[PDB]
Amino acid sequence: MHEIGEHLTTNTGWDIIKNRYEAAQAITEGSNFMIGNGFMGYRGTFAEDGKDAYAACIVTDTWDKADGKWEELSTVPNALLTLLHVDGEPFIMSEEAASFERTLDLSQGVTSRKVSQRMKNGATITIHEEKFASYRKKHAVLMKYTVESDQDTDAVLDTGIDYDVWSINGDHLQGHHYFSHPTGDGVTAKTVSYEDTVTVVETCSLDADASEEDYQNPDGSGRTFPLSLEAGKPVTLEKAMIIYSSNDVDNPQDEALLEAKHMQSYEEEKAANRLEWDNLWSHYDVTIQNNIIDQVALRFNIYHAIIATPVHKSLPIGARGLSCQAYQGAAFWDQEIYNMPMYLYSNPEIARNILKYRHRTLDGARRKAKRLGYEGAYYAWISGKTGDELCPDFFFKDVLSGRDIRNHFNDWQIHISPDIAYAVKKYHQVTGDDAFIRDYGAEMIFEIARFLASHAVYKPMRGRYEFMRVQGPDEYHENVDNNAFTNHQAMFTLQAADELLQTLDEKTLSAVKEKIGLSDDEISLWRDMLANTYVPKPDKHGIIEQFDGYYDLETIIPAKKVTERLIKEDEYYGYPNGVTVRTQCIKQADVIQLFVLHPHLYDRKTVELNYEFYEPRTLHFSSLSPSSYAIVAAQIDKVEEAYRNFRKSVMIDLLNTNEAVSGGTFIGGIHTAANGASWQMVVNGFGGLSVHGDDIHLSPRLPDAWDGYTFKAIVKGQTLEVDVTKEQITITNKSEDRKPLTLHIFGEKSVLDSERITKSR
Template identity: 45%
Template structure:
């Protein structure tokens, strides 16, 4: 598939779409998203509506409208515009052949641009917008009509409340007003379940063109201004600002929205843009990855870094990273294990405070995890598979449907996929060894670690015949095989989580006895429980490599039919069939959805290279990569095995999942479109942990670099234990430059050699 079927490259940061295609409307909206962690405005034209998937998703607005799906709400659209010139409609409507449109998107600053030309006149629409990082509630837009041959221009602009929602309308009780003195409209509504007030305000200022008449039009869910404009030198130009606030943000969102709208109008588009770009410039100083020698790959890297950043609510420690970010309502704007294992690592080694906020979110949702554990008959904290603001389980029991019979499929993501809890414990440890932030672990992380250990204690089963602990009836990362026993990844993660809980228990006992005493009293932790954690960690069954050096993914996996995804594809009756539990085509075969044993290798450096190679060669042809999480993990292992070109092939697969729209928007009857934020975060890992071969463990920082021949070099920044490093990898050298502001020597290893970099020092190593 040629990328030029989807876009053209303008430079390292910018793409152009020269022709709009109806079948790509879902993907345009997601890929060209203006976002900032608070809101995400989809890449749609101003005249488009819900049929074209127009939406602006707002964080912290979880609401249930249909009795099944609790998801984030969409704001009414304050950038809606309808233009008539000489009585004829102007705009690029999919069902009408009136204009041709080109789109540009700048991934450095998140700026969306459109240029539409009429087919039957000289008229042109030029528009530009961004979601501000200086004021997270703001979307700024400048809109221009050029080459107008007619003197009669009618513009309908305002706030449209009839919007695209996946699972029912979340807003009701609409009321709107127009302040003619300030040129500000607002539309107030509240969510149907939680009664959250949502205010959308609009300020505007005409720079070219004279308003000859103005009429306010209120509809059931919308408020508009009907304007007659006299062009100036065949031009009409205005600037406007969309502001969104909810009652979860502050006590009086209406007052704040109107005030902020007026302030934005007073500043003007160009000043607002400069302030926004200044914030982005600071982010890219930390997070940019520079790829030399392949502009397409450089663009793809920037695309994925951008989307990982804008998906993350860095402004809050109470909100999750959604599996589709804020690109749409799919996956409910909620956290999965993706958040810790795929999204967080980039922040951990760049914008460390954001990584801490992500983990604090898990601390604040402990009660939700405790409730889930209790409801299912367990102790401790069983974290939700799909976690919103409260941490209570959002994953419905019937996620997919049988597209042949129409019957619902009972999936057990919400009660059998238990590895999310030890995954969080794993990440707390990784945070600690990357930052030395013991205070965070003592004040926040320890309670999570102990409650997860408690849950695992209550979840394991003791096999008295084998004198070992086992974990039965579960599913691991591979979601096609449910109701299995002793998933290798989950069992190893369980031991790891227990060991880290024990480590910090005894560390606090020695160094923070009073805080440990208070925490034990708070959660009623008994010494007998700690003793049990030790016993389970010592006796839990861990599938070991067999005589062929293979680790069995779960008990009985090797007894299943040995076939390939291509063969199973031919067995489908309907292309939309779900492949997994309970009777999908993959269930009784060795075909897996995604990295599972391979996922174990990317997270745990405890197996020999021979074991990695044997398992990579075995599982790779049996993996469908039906999850966007999978390719980056295979790439990391391929790179560690010295297989640079195989790793690069997986880089291409992962980096272009969204850019080239390779993943389907609907699976098993459920909409799963939107940006794959885990794949976006996975690109950072693929480059840093894969090609640069970075590992961070108790031994310290190390690299095993390998560069694909398609690249001349790659550069990135690291923040390690509060010291900043600039890394450059080329085909024959590896360079580490320590920031002049560093306060400590930074020890690291490249291949088998040890080095120490002083502040300001650059070490150039031949490889």
């Protein structure tokens, strides 16, 4: 049908259309309408755009630390740059264009613009441009650009490679060397810190015959074509931009030249990309019946998750994906807790490879732990190629003094480690993949249990272990003790480790133990900690205290009342002396995050009482927060409140609602964790899907705004399809080697055999 928001609509449920150009909203648009394929992201700019419009092509595995502090992915030369003059006048976007639309077609990752603007000579010029990053040939991004005049006119088209690109924390590439090949130009350059080679090759094909002249200068190269446009006769340019680095392959320039030489036409490459995207959507599409706005917003988020996910090499999903350099193209706990579940239940080999990325980087976690005085694996807060910590000590500034502030994201926020062990165990429960636990997952869980045993303190007069001096998911409170989320998660790891010691076969167990030198003394300490570690529990009013002493901080309800205490609008809110430090205002889900990860650990009334206590004290100043409260709301029958938090979460980028800057650091770009959680809110939230042992739970609720929804979930290799209407719930076991399962729908057991099982409200 209709209207999403600003001036955005959908016509099909698969497309987002913006029909007014406004330069204020251009750029937010560069993120939202971007294209990509897990190897690169190419911002949704128009072919004339460069550094002033924040154009960028961000490429995986090109980390560089040129400014001496921020290691982030490189932005590379732009081989799609294309500039039009019409009788001398440059074509420049105006808000008064006779006609403007930009469209992102989510069914195939094709982004485009159609614009008509009358020029000073009277000619009305129409440009249609479309671009996509090939999911078939992941090193290539392709464009078709067509210009048409309604009136005979001369014009000039320049096209080439722009070296002078936007980069947030210093230019990452130096030493640019021009070269030519039969279909265009190329540039090879080297990164600043590691001196890796990056090559961009441009191919260019123009359908009109015209004298053409090349140019090469220190800021780019290219060629110019004078055109005689005839009334109503369009001229089409097709370009490919191909990128390889020495981290992808041995002699990248050679390789980029071969990929260029064998590239097929724009249309042939477009059809092959469409076939790959049909296959992606067959895994991940979730349908929503009779709410096309919600339907398209969900597809927008899943689309953004997919294009942020590297599948060509063992690499992290960035917390802003490849939409820009913010958050360093690197993995945070968002990767396992927010992004992995869609993959776990829809295409588990992708989840396995996420976890294998954490295995591959376990040495970085071992070195981090040792550097900080611990043992085991303390995973990096911000993980890039090797697993060494990329998060600086001074992430932010105190904007009131101009001084760096020391936030302990990188060394007190320890929950990253047991979050990884949790994800290992979840992946094992859902898939039944024993071999993963034998070869990789058991070693991971035990090194994480060893780390937690080395961080913990024992308090002999209280007879208990405690986790002191931490930062929990609510990052604004640092230096807290016995954060409830972290304590519980630590106990779930130790419990998983204890289970493996009792359950693995003796040969696998001996091998893992000898590999990581695990002693009987440590195993005894883990079992002592399982029996005596303090875990925050519900008080006489049902409330789980967020960390020790949180109840004595100042109650401010609702939490945004604290924003009245700001002196400058862009002050960091948290430690050491931000406005929230001695208040109960929290950045995001912390106790409520516990219930998302462990939905049946506490009973529905305890979860409700904690929801009703913490929601009004949460700022939701991380994109991670609204979806956690949506998922918990859906399952204590606060469905309409869940729906509202669903909308907050699915619309964060589309309708632009979160802070670009905080404490002097750029925080903006696409919110990849929120993209992942879109799927979770429907399937784990409204659907109530969770897996305990052999036990599959479903509890499907239905927002009043929808007439139904449907999703697939793969549990123990069985592909199930769950369809929810007003009246009923249908579960179909699709699949060749089909086995019996056993459900729990709204708390009743009902052994599934073979395609029947309809039940009601």
